[PDB]
Structure 1
């Protein structure tokens, strides 16, 4: 509350560390469905169904231009990528499986780096 603060968690490396995580996700062999924004002209249903599209290139540009206020808003957009993927793709599809694999990979790196 006013003039009563918990001890200061060191967040000075968060930007560098989120960038490293994102590099690892970018270079994963199963990243290919997520590297670029879904083409809303060429994929029927996407625009109407997926209210907030997100992809790794969009996260990278947001990261690089100070559009994440803290490490939690960064994790929310990464998870959005995988939540969108599960909304639109069957579990038993190459893309559906890719999304599960990547979400697992992410959540481990997240825990090991920050928890």
Structure 2
């Protein structure tokens, strides 16, 4: 509270580290469904069904232009990518599987990088 300051982690490397993690995502072989925004004019249903579209290139742009206030807002967007994927794709599909794989991949890197 006022004048009662919690000791707080060093966050000067967070921007660099998030960019590092995002780069590993981008270069994963199962990243292809998530590299670019879904084309809302070619994919039936998507615009109406998915209220907050998100993809790695949009996250990269936001990260590069200071649009994430902190590491958790970054993680929220990454997770949004995979939550959208689950919303629109069957688990038993190529894209569906890719999403599960990429989510697992991210969360381990997240834990390994930040939660000591």
Interval containing the TM-score (normalised by the shorter chain) = over 0.9
Between the aligned partners of 2:2 and 2:108, the Cα distance in structure 1 is: 36
Q: What SS does the aligned partner of 2:33 have?
A: helix
Once the two structures are superposed, residues 13-64 of structure 1 have per-residue CA deviations (whole angstroms, 9 ceiling, x without a partner) of 0000000000000000000000000000000000000000000000000000
Q: Give the deviation of 1:8 after TM superposition.
A: 2.5
TM-score normalized with structure 2 length: 0.99
Corresponding position of 1:98: 98
Question: Number of paired residues?
Answer: 115
Give the RMSD, CA atoms, in angstroms. 0.3
Report which stretch shifted further, 54-63 or 2-11: 2-11
* C-alpha distance in structure 2 between counterparts of 1:60 and 1:27, whole Å: 13
Instruction: Give distance in 1, aligned partners of 2:108 and 2:97.
Output: 17
In structure 2, distance between residues paired with 1:9 and 1:60: 24
Give the secondary structure class of the aligned counterpart of 1:92: coil
Q: Which stretches of structure 1, 4 residues or longer, exceed 3 Å deviation after superposition?
A: none
Correspondences of 1:1-115 after superposition (within 5 Å): 1-115=1-115
